[PDB]
Design a binder for this molecule. Structure first.
Ligand SMILES: CC(C)=CCC/C(C)=C/CC/C(C)=C/COP(=O)(O)OP(=O)(O)O
Ligand SMILES: CC(C)=CCC/C(C)=C/CC/C(C)=C/COP(=O)(O)OP(=O)(O)O
Ligand SMILES: C=C(C)CCSP(=O)(O)OP(=O)(O)O
Ligand SMILES: [Mg+2]
Ligand SMILES: [Mg+2]
Lengths: 313, 326
């Protein structure tokens, strides 16, 4: 019973080798050092929109609660990021689960503190859609992965639902009408779709900080985005190239050549502009005001619908 | 008039209600979310049982549907924990069946849980009562605080009855107390009556856990060693052991070194044996069980026979929670 024969010494060792616990329990301090350092924390794009929207609607404790929704939204965003990191593929995805749950529980806590069940419903739906989108991203009929309509549903759940429902939440907290609320929702929904679509293009285009030659992150990892989906309508031969990207990694470069002879990038950007225009229409349709701060915010919101398209970063 | 049988059919109604409530396309998300809600794999539905009985106990089917909601939300919250719990605590078994983290993977388990939480908030919103939203949000915060304590605390912290008492409340009794309070609040009972419903849930929950911790050691039969000892094998340190450490300090290094040397399981049982640990744990549980019964006793007098029958069964659980042979 070999293990039984040397238990004495095993425990001396097992004990000693708890030098990694104890000593080195701090020097989590790396964790704190790493968090500050990151490359962000965030650009605060969702927060910017939400604070602007709060101002952009005619109506302190209210401004405190409105910011409450920007706070909740960030909490919900990071929790979804973390849970999406939970790997099936040492594994660190116990950290992601615990941290995600702390943020979600804090979100619930803060939703409860708003004392508005209608906004609770909106962020509840937001959470459900994020979860739905991620399931869609992971599981999928091979056929499904190649449908532009499916991609756009998935894109809506993953990227636009959180922001649309938050924009609507800000409307509802501010006591706006059902018809104004549906405007703020539509601003977020449409701006969000545009933002993601521009993100998809930037992966292939690159950036000024980029080489400047796209990182190609999506296509390396078999994530199929709008430009490539559009390019497959033109070149059916491309379906085969994209499939064989893992098997043979030079199929990335070949995919790139197809895209460059196609209207894929153009068609994704034209779709983004269509969405961004619709967002600016939503602000345009907002009830007339005389307030200068309010009108300044609405101009900003509309400005954001232009800057989202022309992003080089 | 038996409390489980007295509520059994509404539990099946709730059971089926949960199934549509948890339904979702995408289908893969549906498989995951529904997994612990089908006939046979719902668990013993003790939280629901207490809630339906409590619902009747407080009284005067327009409002009952709302009260049922609380049991459904509570069950959804509950199952959400388990799913997340199984990814942590790295299980392969739950409810006599493959756990979701083995069957469907870690990712689906965690998404299913988030899904169930959001449906729970959804249903909480639909009830349009802000105090009820806050009561169940507290419960969710408490679950996370409690799960975190069971993991995170340093060694010196974990080995006191104070710590155990807090962790148990957050991890186990908070869901029962707050949902008990919510049921009461939904009926627009005075603030004081809501507290009575809260003290009941709180004390019954704490008493249930104490007895469960003892049964790990004793088992079906009364004496020591018949039980599975699953907690102490894995290095979970429940009340019997903690009380024993009050008598025998040297037991701390023994229990702390259990994982490394599984022969330290036997040494700990010898220490438990000489101690009054099992006994004091029981004595604590009997004290909680008392306060629970006492709370129901302070409820306002009623004429209704169906109410009395239901009040008597909540008390019956007060005795049964101590008595449970298993
Ligand atoms: C729903 C959602 C996620 C919406 C996005 C919100 C939004 C439009 C954020 C701002 C984007 C922006 C101004 C980028 C600047 O890049 P740049 O290269 O244009 O820098 P520059 O404008 O200073 O030249
Ligand atoms: C709302 C949500 C998703 C919260 C996450 C926090 C979390 C994982 C809580 C777990 C609470 C719980 C029921 C523990 C019991 O499991 P046990 O291991 O003590 O005993 P058991 O596995 O046999 O139930
Ligand atoms: C505090 C309680 C009454 C707990 C019992 S819940 P428990 O996890 O034991 O039971 P299930 O739902 O069957 O898994
Ligand atoms: Mg477990
Ligand atoms: Mg646990």
């Amino acid at each position: 019973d070999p293990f039984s024969l040397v238990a004495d010494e095993l425990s001396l060792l097992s004990n000693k080798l708890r030098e990694m616990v104890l000593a080195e329990v701090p020097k989590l301090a790396s964790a704190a050092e790493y968090f500050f350092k990151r490359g962000v924390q965030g650009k605060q794009f969702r927060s910017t929109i939400l604070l602007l929207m709060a101002t952009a609607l005619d109506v302190s404790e209210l401004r405190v609660r409105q910011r409450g929704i920007a706070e909740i939204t960030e909490m919900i965003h990071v929790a979804s990021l973390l849970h999406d990191d939970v790997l099936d593929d040492v594994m660190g995805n116990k950290m992601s689960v615990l941290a995600g749950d702390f943020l979600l529980s804090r979100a619930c806590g803060a939703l409860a503190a708003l004392k508005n069940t209608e906004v609770v419903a909106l962020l509840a739906t937001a959470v459900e859609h994020l979860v739905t989108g991620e399931t869609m991203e992971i599981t999928s009929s091979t056929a499904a992965r190649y449908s532009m309509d499916y991609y756009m549903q998935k894109t809506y759940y993953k990227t636009a639902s959180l922001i649309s429902n938050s924009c609507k939440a800000v409307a509802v907290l501010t006591g706006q009408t059902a018809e104004v609320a549906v405007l703020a929702f539509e601003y977020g929904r449409n701006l969000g779709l545009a933002f993601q679509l521009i993100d998809d293009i930037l992966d292939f285009t690159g950036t000024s900080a980029s080489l400047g030659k796209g990182s190609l992150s999506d296509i390396r990892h078999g994530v199929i985005t709008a430009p490539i989906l559009f390019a497959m309508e033109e070149f059916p031969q491309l379906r085969e190239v994209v499939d064989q990207v893992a098997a043979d990694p030079r199929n990335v470069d070949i995919a790139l050549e197809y895209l460059g002879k196609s209207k894929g990038i153009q068609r994704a950007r034209e779709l983004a502009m269509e969405h961004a225009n619709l967002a600016a229409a939503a602000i345009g349709s907002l009830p007339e005001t005389d307030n200068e701060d309010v009108k300044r915010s609405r101009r900003a919101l509309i400005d954001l619908t232009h800057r989202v398209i022309t992003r080089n970063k």
